[PDB]
Amino acid sequence: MFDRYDAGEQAVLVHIYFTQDKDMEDLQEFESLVSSAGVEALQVITGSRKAPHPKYFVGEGKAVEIAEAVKATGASVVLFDHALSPAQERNLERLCECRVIDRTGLILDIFAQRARTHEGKLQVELAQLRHLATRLVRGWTHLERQKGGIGLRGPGETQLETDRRLLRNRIVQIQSRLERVEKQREQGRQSRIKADVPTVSLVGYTNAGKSTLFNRITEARVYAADQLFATLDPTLRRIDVADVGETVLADTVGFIRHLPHDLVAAFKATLQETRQATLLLHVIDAADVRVQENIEAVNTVLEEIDAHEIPTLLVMNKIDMLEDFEPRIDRDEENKPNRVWLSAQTGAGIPQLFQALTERLSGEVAQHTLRLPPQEGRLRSRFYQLQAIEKEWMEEDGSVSLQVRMPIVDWRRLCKQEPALIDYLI
RNA sequence: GCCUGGCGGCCGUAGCGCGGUGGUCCCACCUGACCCCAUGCCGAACUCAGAAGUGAAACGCCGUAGCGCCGAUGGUAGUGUGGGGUCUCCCCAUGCGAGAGUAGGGAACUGCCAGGC
RNA sequence: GGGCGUUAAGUUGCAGGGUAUAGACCCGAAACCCGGUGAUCUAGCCAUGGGCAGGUUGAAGGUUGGGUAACACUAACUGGAGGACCGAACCGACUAAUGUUGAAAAAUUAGCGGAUGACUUGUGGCUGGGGGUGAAAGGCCAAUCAAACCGGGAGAUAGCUGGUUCUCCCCGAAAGCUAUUUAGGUAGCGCCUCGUGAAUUCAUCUCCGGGGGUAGAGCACUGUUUCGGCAAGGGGGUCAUCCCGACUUACCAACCCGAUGCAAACUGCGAAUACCGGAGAAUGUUAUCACGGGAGACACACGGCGGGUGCUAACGUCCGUCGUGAAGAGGGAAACAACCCAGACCGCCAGCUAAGGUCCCAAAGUCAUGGUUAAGUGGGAAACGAUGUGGGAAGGCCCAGACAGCCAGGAUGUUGGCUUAGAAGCAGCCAUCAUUUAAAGAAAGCGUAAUAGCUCACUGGUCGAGUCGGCCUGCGCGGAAGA
RNA sequence: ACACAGGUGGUCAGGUAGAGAAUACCAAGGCGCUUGAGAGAACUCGGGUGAAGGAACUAGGCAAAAUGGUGCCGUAACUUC
RNA sequence: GUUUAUUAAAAACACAGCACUGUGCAAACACGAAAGUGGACGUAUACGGUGUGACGCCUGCCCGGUGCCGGAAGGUUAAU
RNA sequence: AAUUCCUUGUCGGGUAAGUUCCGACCUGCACGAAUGGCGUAAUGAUGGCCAGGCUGUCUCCACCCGAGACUCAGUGAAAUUGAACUCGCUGUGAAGAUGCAGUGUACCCGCGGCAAGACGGAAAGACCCCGUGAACCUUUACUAUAGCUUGACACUGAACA
RNA sequence: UCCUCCUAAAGAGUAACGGAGGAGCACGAAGGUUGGCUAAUCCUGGUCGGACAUCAGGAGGUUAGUGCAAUGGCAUAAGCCAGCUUGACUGCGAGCGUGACGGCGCGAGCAGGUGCGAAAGCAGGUCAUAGUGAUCCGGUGGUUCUGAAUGGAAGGGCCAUCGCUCAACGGAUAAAAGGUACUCCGGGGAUAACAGGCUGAUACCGCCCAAGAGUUCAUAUCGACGGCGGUGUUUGGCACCUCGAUGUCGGCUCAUCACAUCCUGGGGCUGAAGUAGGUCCCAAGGGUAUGGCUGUUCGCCAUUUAAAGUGGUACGCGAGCUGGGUUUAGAACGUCGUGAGACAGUUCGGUCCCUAUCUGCCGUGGGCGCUGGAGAACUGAGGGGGGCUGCUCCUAGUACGAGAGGACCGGAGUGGACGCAUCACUGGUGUUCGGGUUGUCAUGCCAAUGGCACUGCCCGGUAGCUAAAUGCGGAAGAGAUAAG
RNA sequence: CGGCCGCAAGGUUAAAACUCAAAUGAAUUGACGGGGGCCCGCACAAGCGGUGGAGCAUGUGGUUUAAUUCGAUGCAACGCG
RNA sequence: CGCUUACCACUUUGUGAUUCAUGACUGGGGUGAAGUCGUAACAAGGUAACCGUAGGGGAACCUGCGGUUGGAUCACCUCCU
């Protein structure tokens, strides 16, 4: 639907503590989501085992009770934390004078509020069009009351089937424009895969995900705030990590547990950076009672886009209060197996984050020095033109050795097709 | 020919303001009242009897434009009729022609009948 | 006081115009009711007679074929029931094809289903129409069936359609208002005609007496704004100093004070016109009003102006007013109801002319003067873009030489430091003192793998005559893709 | 409505092959169906035969193509035996 | 097995079975303005109606409304 | 699910690919016990699906045989029809032009074919709406009435508490 | 139905399913008269007065009030208090206003009796406009009327009064709900569905500016906030047309046009090392899949290809075909309703007619003309057909490149789809050739033949025709050009 | 799970992986009993006087600032060290 | 020798049976330890227990019927067979 819910709207929240559907939902998570939406909740109903109802997703008497509660509260709309089937919302809508909305609609609504860009607006519109396509079946019958079953001649098919085809034609046109936005990113991606720069995408929960991590690393202005979500479109800036060289970091939007399946598809269409990320990072926050519950959900979103496989260093947030680990630049092993604990909110650790980046960077334990061309002065001018080696030292017999080791590069250019007729060194 | 009281005309060039001025001519206060009347208590109001006292206030007169108020000519908006271009809008001939400003005017004038030179 | 009256001409024929009641101009329903005719088609039932080639399976009756304490267990085979099977006659009708003005108002050809049964068939009979009969379909009851056929009431009724037949002359509408079991019908009124009366009646214009609240303006009022001024009260920086102060704060002040807009439901103003009344010429076949006879119309259309609604869309809708079409031809706008000119009594192988035009189609200027455009503009299109072209008033510079191009000089400190033998702008800064001002930048863009180089402030530039921009304006240009 | 491809109750029932009143061919008997002559286009109808592939056709194996008899063996799930 | 003769042959209808109800015979019920007749020359192991549909397993809870059946303490109640 | 809107629900199968099918899950918009619930051998011109075989259904048609169609002789209709000297395009127009305007093109007549158009023929559209139209059906619409039922009076008498 | 404002264009009047609000009463005082009186707002000093009371003073005719909506009014007050009261009287009413009428409204004054005031005088309801209901039919009271032979009386009339959410408010009647997919009649494109027409809000496409996004870097690539256009092209609006008839999706067959171009050609920019792309310009000559599911356009998928364009053509095409779809009558399920029945639910089943006059095409003739009549061979004004491409190899592993990879030049072969011809080959067919064979009948019979059974069934097959067979081709050039 | 039986409900035959240092039996000594018995104590009863709402003093639940120093916390801390 | 017939390996077709992995969903293990609900059993465990079998709890468990002991206990001052 082109229309989206207005912020500041009065509303009621109906959440069964056990609302079925695997019960991975959290009421504390719901309050953060509703605050961003602009829902004004006078009363939050908490219930025990209301039978999932084919009619209302809540007990038939409870549906009358929530209708009575809504009439008294003055709340303009009804919000339900677990999913309502298209009939299920429609039956609830008949019982109360006020209209109703659902969590799939509410997360879709949240995306609209946090979107300030054209790519985000088209992406949100497509996702709503998919969710509303299922929702519109009840609405189409109400529209056809005026039609009175006319349209038998012209379209051979029964009336209202043609109306679905027109919405589907709008869906087909919508898909073509969305493809163009991705195609433009892919032309940029073709230049981006120069093979000299790795692609990095930062993923996480809406609050746990550290898009703030880019701010400590690049000191670049970005919108990081308490409001749920709020970074819908990705930001890519140049960061030269000393250990890995030039790298590009992309801020993928944060996601929540039980993410609407259409919304993961829409998020991926904008975020193909997640699909192509050579290095990926997941951030976990202690604000939720169980850090583990957020971890499994992030994996499911990654599984949806098939990026779950990449081995990932895990960053941590809320560490500032905990102060459990002070960042330490010590390698117990060359692999250095650990999960980074530094949090970007206070800038706790930077060289230690880089040590984890050295673990990410491919390295040789032997680090055998590459053969070096004879003219150091010409090499130094080339280093000034490109990258000067961080450590360079003289070696015995007039040899020069540098910390960067590239034996394959020296074989490919310095010693490949040379005749060596003189054969001074055999 | 002056100053006062009434009853009108005209109702801001008429009003308000500021400063002055006048007293048994008048007028206003003022003096008394379990008297005629009179307060939903109220001789601040209304009456009645009248002398002292004063123009303080009021009242009237004079100056003062500080504001009110009136306000040209010219220009403009509009519009009647014919004609034209015809973005919803105009333009031309022609007749009528604002409001708002502006220079300015502006502190009234006049009748009738009684009390005082 | 009023209201209705006051001896005011009628009556009967004949002819015509209306209205009422009858079939009431004419044709045309679906239906309803009444009395009959059909069960030779069909549906059920009754009575009495027929048919079912062939082939197969085989029940019961089992005369009976073992054994257990006894039960369980369990032992041979003649017959000929079946709403049995396969399949002709027979009955039906599942798919396809042809036919569909056929051979046929449901058939033909290939395949199909039942065919000893709740079968089929012949001959009679019975049940009759709001009735029958129904293994149930609103099936069937003579190619007719949510109620047969025939005659009657019957020319039912039909605010609905269609048609309405000879000639000429005169006038000539309306598609509005109010009502409606009413919206496509009707009644009254307005508009048309015919007659009879009547006064400078009516119109146009001039002059005069009005009243308003429209346009337009304006913001005092009702609201709606913007800015500047700003402590009343509270935010409150001091504040468990409210401190009868540390201040009223380093915030809005609230009315308020100056300016600025906006209004259909705002008005301290206020037109043009329109309306009403009066007088007066001139004119118009009393054009006006009243009464009586006869209507039609009460579906309007477009354009102009003033608006509502829509999207300042619609050949949209709904109003007010005018014009045209309707109901008006002719000339023009290529063709064209409503747009422009003009209102056709007739004839002429006569002139003038409106709108519109004068190169050919195609009547008339290859007319005159001056100017503009170079696109075929003319001959579809906006925001915007541009040394297209033409005009106008200004500004700077210039014979201490206009504007170009052009080459050289344009350098220490100021390579001094700071991501480091790049330390200097390319990550940033300290910087403007000048030495040696014809001239010299601790520079605008750069570049070199730092360290060279580039253009320009000044000079000499011969050539030199005008030169650089802006504004306003006429006509062009690009923006500019359809089957 | 017709000199109409439909409908119309019973009876008789030869030969050969065949279970048979199926069917093929014949008896006895009756007929060639009241417009013909050419030519041998498309197209239409009713058929015949098809290389290779074989349901790819199509809404759907619609239609067509196949199998088909008698004798002897042999025969599953389930079962109301 | 029957059926929409003449666009529907079906999952429709029927069916044997099962229950519920009425019905004592001059039966109930029907066609009859009535006589009569069918039911039936039958007699509750019979008839009529309604529903379901062989078979196997079964048919839970509820009489609040409406109907039907039984009862009236009182009230209301026509003609007269 | 002859029932589930969403829905092509989710899984597993069968295919290269399966909205059908089959089997599970229960989240029954809107199953449920003679308005019958669940199964069921046999049966079905029943509904849906999957195989083997087979083929002109198909790729993609080809040839052949007969009946027409063609020509010749004889007999000899039909629907329809305001009149026609009956092109195309673009525009206009009661808004889809053989007939108007402009332009291109076009000697005059058949015969055999194809159907793009003559808003082609057939049939006062069947869809929609109106008529202070009609029929039939239903009920808790109004007004009645058959039918059932209740009392009184008559037909209809006597005697004893 | 009534009242008030606006639209309503300064007389009045004026419509819409146009924008805003009220009434279906109240008071015997809130009426009449006489007399008196004058507000809302803040400030100052003061009680449990402080923003809220009540004082003493300071602003105005009034920002107050009006029984209640709105507008017009209002100081002489209509506003507020007191006293006395009942004119909230009866009969009439010159004259107006407003309506088509029925009616509604104002009305000085006359007459008879009241009230208040000394008097002038004023009063026939409320400051005004809403607060209502005709007629019929009945009820009650009075009456100076009539009363069916007469005297009465019932009954009627007149006068006063009563009974209507007759609210659909100019009111059919005392009294009235639904269904029809079983439907039928008379009309209407006066009125919706399909298509065409207007429009273009939406849609789609393009441009204007450019905060941004881009590894630094608005325009390589997209572009927020806003703006302007184009098209008829999607959703809509309208109702001009079509209801005495314009067949509805899809598929099959057959097409044609536009260029907003999918492939193939030519370019520009690139954040284009090569390969491969992105974006834009020019360019319409040709080309632009097969299947599974399902009725599908769609969609999802599997696998092709150089690509499997986007639209118009009545969302092309039913006198061309289909009928899965919808769109009838049978049945069932879920839900709604007491029910008949219903469903923008599902499911199974369910009649698609035309002999071509005209234009139009596709083929093929006749007549006359072209100037004496013939028989030939041609020029070419015009017109049509044809215009596709892949794969491999050389150049060359060269250019390009750190590698991985790997050339828009220039040559050669080889195919796919398409069109044309042909029948030498390979095949098909071949009822008009030969043979085998089942059943029967005939020619006397054996033998040999023939008829009939689909050509009886087959097996083969010549000519001819034909594809699945083989040949051939879409070119190279040349001229004028588009972007460049 | 398979077999067999059963109309079902279920019966019978009857494992495995996985897990633990136990699981159990009878006795002993205590503790405890909303088990029984006998007793005792202002424990109850029979009485007398108080506490539970006004100034001293103590702690905590606890607040506050510079601290409101530390401890004592049912009975057996709370006029306590 | 060629040829033919029997036997037969590879192989192929149909139809079954038994093993292993796996098959959304679903049924049922001991368990780090605190924020985590009731009290069924052990005392007569506050309704004696558990044994079979049905139905209900939808927390252990409750209740019906039969069984078993692997069950605790013998009374308030208080006129009279």
Ligand SMILES: Nc1nc2c(ncn2[C@@H]2O[C@@H](COP(=O)(O)OP(=O)(O)OP(=O)(O)O)[C@@H](O)[C@H]2O)c(=O)[nH]1
């Ligand atoms: N974890 C954590 N975050 C903190 C802390 N303090 C402040 N923050 C902020 O909380 C974070 C909020 O979540 P974000 O990291 O913004 O989530 P995000 O995914 O970047 O946000 P979106 O992309 O807008 O959804 C950042 O804004 C941090 O700066 C802290 O102590 N811990």
